Amino acid sequence: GAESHELQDVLEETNIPKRLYKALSLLKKEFELSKLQQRLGREVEEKIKQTHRKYLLQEQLKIIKKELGLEKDDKDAIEEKFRERLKELVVPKHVMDVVDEELSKLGLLDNHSSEFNVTRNYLD
Amino acid sequence: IIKKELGLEKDDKDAIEEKFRERLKELVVPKHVMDVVDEELSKLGLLDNHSSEFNVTRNYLD
Numbered sequence: 001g002a003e004s005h006e007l008q009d010v011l012e013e014t015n016i017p018k019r020l021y022k023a024l025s026l027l028k029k030e031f032e033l034s035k036l037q038q039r040l041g042r043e044v045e046e047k048i049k050q051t052h053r054k055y056l057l058q059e060q061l062k063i064i065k066k067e068l069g070l071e072k073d074d075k076d077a078i079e080e081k082f083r084e085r086l087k088e089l090v091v092p093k094h095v096m097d098v099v100d101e102e103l104s105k106l107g108l109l110d111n112h113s114s115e116f117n118v119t120r121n122y123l124d
Numbered sequence: 125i126i127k128k129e130l131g132l133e134k135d136d137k138d139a140i141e142e143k144f145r146e147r148l149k150e151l152v153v154p155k156h157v158m159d160v161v162d163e164e165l166s167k168l169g170l171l172d173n174h175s176s177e178f179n180v181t182r183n184y185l186d
Contacts, residue, residue, distance in 0.1 A: 074167065
């Protein structure tokens with residue numbers, strides 16, 4: 001891929017050895033350039049894989065933490081809390097199914113949603 | 125195994141939980157507010173700092 005100047009220089013050479021060696025050297029320079037060109041992108045590949053792998057080790061220890069560190073708390077635990085809170089009470093049946101429906105909603109409702117907070121407040 | 129894995133990435137923590145705990149330590153704090161703050165702090169820790177409910181929860185704590 002040498003510039004036309006290099007090709008002209010090769011042509012000017014009359015001796016066969018001179019032109020052959022010049023052509024070989026030009027070929028290896030053009031290979032150097034092109035391999036730099038492609039190496040930039042392949043190095044991007046390597047960087048993104050490296051960061052993903054580091055995040056994957058972080059993720060392994062973070063899953064173990066989720067089991068232990070976060071304890072998987074609040075996974076519909078308020079439902080059981082209120083179940084026990086209502087356990088001692090001799091509660092009617094219509095309000096029993098109302099509480100069951102509210103619990104199903106709350107499990108379906110996302111914790112962040114203000115509707116979820118209002119549902120928890122009403123159930124309280 | 126857990127503690128060595130964490131040691132691989134040991135350094136972390138912003139320490140707001142314990143900050144409010146020590147803030148209330150001096151005061152003779154009623155049990156009602158203590159349990160309410162415990163529930164609020166459990167909701168906070170189980171929620172990411174980004175979530176707006178996290179900010180509202182922290183404001184309630186303050």
